[PDB]
């Protein structure tokens, strides 16, 4: 699955100091970034423009530039009238998922101080189930701006699918790319008296889905404690899998790695004898 996620982080220290920074993700890949101090989108991939013409691309950029200024002025005016105290953090999560099997679904979620407050549902703004009373005052005002509503709908229901389809075409190779992990063992801090912490590291794999387990022959060890899948600077992943055991019982244990990049050849690392 390759959903497009457009993300916006807007911080307001006070009514005179603000900062808006955005980014776009196609699946697990970051395709775009847009800093507060730039008038233009920074394309992070050679295929970031998709199938859009230079003209269509300048139109989308114009829309964001207008939106960014307008969002800022609007939040400041809502804060003033609704007696909302600074600092304010607003977050936006918008995009779509192109499904050749069915239609396409889109979303536009807004958060205030790390909590959901409203979303764009069909052709209008809807507040979150448990949202403060001032949110319904802001929704009324937002829904009065019919032209913005028609634009958000045009972007989510027409432009986003056209953008995603093109990125998926121009990006075919980079999205289907395979990077092989390299595995290594280590001994972690003792988790008891005569106990051993058996650590298995797996780094440099792409794509993100992986399977790492401590084994004893073909018997999967249920004591395997996986860590979080952590990122690397070169767009690959890291994963640490542990096993708390008796010191004697470590001999015969193996770390086994399954990854799509492996050519039918799982990584098997034996605990040293």
């Amino acid at each position, epitope marked *: 699955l390759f959903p497009l996620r457009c993300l916006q982080i807007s911080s307001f220290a006070n009514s005179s100091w603000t900062r808006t920074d955005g980014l776009a993700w196609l699946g697990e890949l970051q395709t775009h970034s847009w800093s507060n101090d730039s008038d233009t989108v920074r394309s992070l991939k050679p295929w970031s423009q998709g199938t859009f013409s230079d003209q269509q691309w300048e139109t989308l950029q114009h829309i964001f530039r207008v939106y960014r200024s307008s969002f800022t002025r609007d939040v400041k005016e809502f804060a003033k009238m609704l007696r909302l105290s600074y600092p304010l953090e607003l977050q936006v999560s918008a995009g779509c998922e192109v499904h050749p099997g069915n239609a396409s679904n889109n979303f536009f979620h807004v958060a205030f101080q790390g909590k959901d407050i409203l979303s764009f549902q069909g052709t209008s703004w809807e507040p979150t189930q448990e949202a403060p009373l001032w949110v319904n005052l802001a929704i009324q005002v937002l829904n009065q701006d019919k*032209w913005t509503r028609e634009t958000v709908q045009w972007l989510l229901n*027409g432009t986003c699918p056209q953008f995603v389809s093109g990125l998926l075409e121009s990006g075919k190779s980079e999205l289907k790319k395979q990077v092989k992990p390299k595995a290594w063992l280590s001994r972690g801090p003792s988790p008891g008296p005569g106990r051993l912490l058996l650590v298995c590291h797996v780094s440099g794999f792409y794509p993100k889905p992986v399977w790492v387990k401590w084994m004893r022959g073909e018997q999967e060890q249920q004591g395997t404690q996986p860590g979080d899948i952590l990122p690397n600077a070169d767009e690959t992943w890291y994963l640490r899998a542990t096993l708390d055991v008796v010191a004697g019982e470590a001999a015969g244990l193996s770390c086994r790695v399954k990854h799509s990049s492996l050519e039918g050849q799982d990584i098997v690392l034996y605990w040293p004898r």
Partner: T-cell receptor
Amino acid sequence: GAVVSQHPSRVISKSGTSVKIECRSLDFQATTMFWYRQFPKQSLMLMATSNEGSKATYEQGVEKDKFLINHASLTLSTLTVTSAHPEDSSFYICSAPGGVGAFFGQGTRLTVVE
Amino acid sequence: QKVTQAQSSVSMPVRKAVTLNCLYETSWWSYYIFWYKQLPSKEMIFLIRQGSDEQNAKSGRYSVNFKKAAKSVALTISALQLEDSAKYFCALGVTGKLTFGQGTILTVHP
């Protein structure tokens, strides 16, 4: 009623003088204004885009120094027809995005006499 | 982005109906089509809008026969009155940036 006002509605100018046309948004803030030109018995051709903060965008085939655009504020865009000649005698109409698409001004009937 | 109005002039008697044709070209998957009339004062009067993902638009005496596949957006003016004599412009636009066709002069006869 109209929410965008152009001033003046009519202007007679001598060749070689620069003509200033104003486009005002009435009781709304506009961050963009589109400027169109219509020659007699012709269609409306988009000339340029007036932007707040950034410079004007000119359309393909438009002479950039002939027309000086300036987004003075969030309610005012000016078009200056620098050193006008009878060939520049036309009808200039601005619009502001909004409503169901864009709000048009009433236009400026510009006649340049030698 | 191009809008073509092939008819330069159309004449029709009062109380009848007329059809003004419009063909367009656009690289956008979703867009809006507009119809305008220009007064002898040169003032632009919005008539009707048609969304690419909408049902055939209808606003009083104005109707659109939107044919998405053929990329045609004709305007029918029903029960024609002398006040309908004007130059009618078809336009394609996204986010207020409208591009106009050549225009069609309609002359309603008594």
